Design a protein around this ligand. Structure first.
Ligand SMILES: N[C@@H](CCC(=O)N[C@@H](CS)C(=O)NCC(=O)O)C(=O)O
Ligand SMILES: N[C@@H](CCC(=O)N[C@@H](CS)C(=O)NCC(=O)O)C(=O)O
Ligand SMILES: N[C@@H](CCC(=O)N[C@@H](CS)C(=O)NCC(=O)O)C(=O)O
Lengths: 146, 146, 146
């Protein structure tokens, strides 16, 4: 059903492109600092670029999972918008962290707020889905008795 | 189609929340042991918490992929239940590993059993989907000749 | 809708199995080189196997995201085929890297070509989806004026 998930798919693809950009930046840093695989250690500046990419990579599935659940169960447009805010914050996090550990913090907090909102939308969407059938099953069981 | 995937979505969200918990625990360990990014090395106790989170993060997409394939092609309820068992085992793995490398092992084995079962359900679901059309195409080709 | 995504699901499961294989190979290397968690450092040969697995793991969500978007918005068969080429290239990357850092390069380039093609298919699929409604909204706005 292309129609109900195309914005989620577009934000998903933008996320992939951003992760590709982070990967290309790590490769560029490896060349500049002459840090050859399999090493992932070197001068703090190399290690910051490496770490910024790794941190973005490990949250990326959380972002995808929440984006799709929130977008399907809550509202597609709102999930997509929160996803865009998340991804812009991650770009700033990567750029910030590369420059200095301390500059990762403000955009990290912005990314965490965007992701927490997606989590909240996904949870509310699922509650709206399940809570009714559950409260009903509960009541039908108490009616039987009563 | 909210209706046929809501339990998969709920287990997915629970998985996201658990990964968020692991991330918050690593941040707490960084503060306690004063290990500042970009370092990921320090006392064994810090390194165990870091590593437990990283290991959970790298299997998390495998869990999501298998959960959804098994849930769609085999049975939603069974996939969801195996997913819940996986996630509880991962929580125990994280808690165990943080305390000691050796305490990661029992829950790691439980998580691997749950994930292997999801893989098996997904494979059986796909076999049920493809094998028929394939054996038919095979037979139609031999009938033509015969 | 099993019917329109079964090949994407099958390539997804194959990807999971391959990642499981990489994980089992790292465990085998840990035993052979006696590198106990939480360490991820040791002789270059151990570090290459570890790193090859980690690199495959961090691209794996990019591969899944692009596979599904390309397969849904562009063409299922073509996305599945590019996915298979990607996964075979990753197997070669892992085998190559384990033997030597330099032997990772050719299969890395092949994997990057396959993934870039998936990205391109996904983008073209989404453009075909959105561009029309957008150019129409644009024109309706200029017609009103004109
Ligand atoms: N893998 C992360 C998990 C926790 C996390 O996301 N921490 C934040 C705030 S300390 C971070 O920017 N981590 C820096 C990094 O991963 O290099 C870590 O090692 O810290
Ligand atoms: N990235 C993992 C891949 C293999 C794996 O999952 N190993 C298990 C059993 S040795 C584990 O608990 N790894 C500990 C860790 O990742 O820190 C590793 O380095 O070991
Ligand atoms: N995490 C990767 C991101 C960039 C990347 O994929 N680099 C390629 C070409 S240098 C690679 O084979 N990395 C080796 C590795 O990750 O161990 C890295 O540290 O290099």
């Amino acid at each position: 059903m292309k129609d109900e998930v195309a914005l989620l798919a577009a934000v998903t693809l933008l996320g992939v492109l951003l992760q590709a950009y982070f990967s290309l930046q790590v490769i560029s840093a490896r060349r500049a600092f002459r840090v050859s695989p399999p090493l992932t250690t070197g001068p703090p500046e190399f290690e910051r670029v490496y770490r910024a990419q790794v941190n973005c990579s490990e949250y990326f599935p959380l972002f995808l999972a929440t984006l799709w659940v929130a977008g399907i169960f809550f509202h597609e447009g709102a999930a997509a918008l929160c996803g865009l805010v998340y991804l812009f914050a991650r770009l700033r996090y990567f750029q910030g962290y590369a420059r200095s550990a301390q500059l990762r913090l403000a955009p990290l907090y912005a990314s965490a707020r965007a992701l927490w909102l997606l989590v909240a939308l996904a949870a509310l969407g699922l509650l709206a889905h399940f809570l009714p059938a559950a409260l009903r099953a509960a009541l039908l069981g108490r009616l039987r008795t009563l």
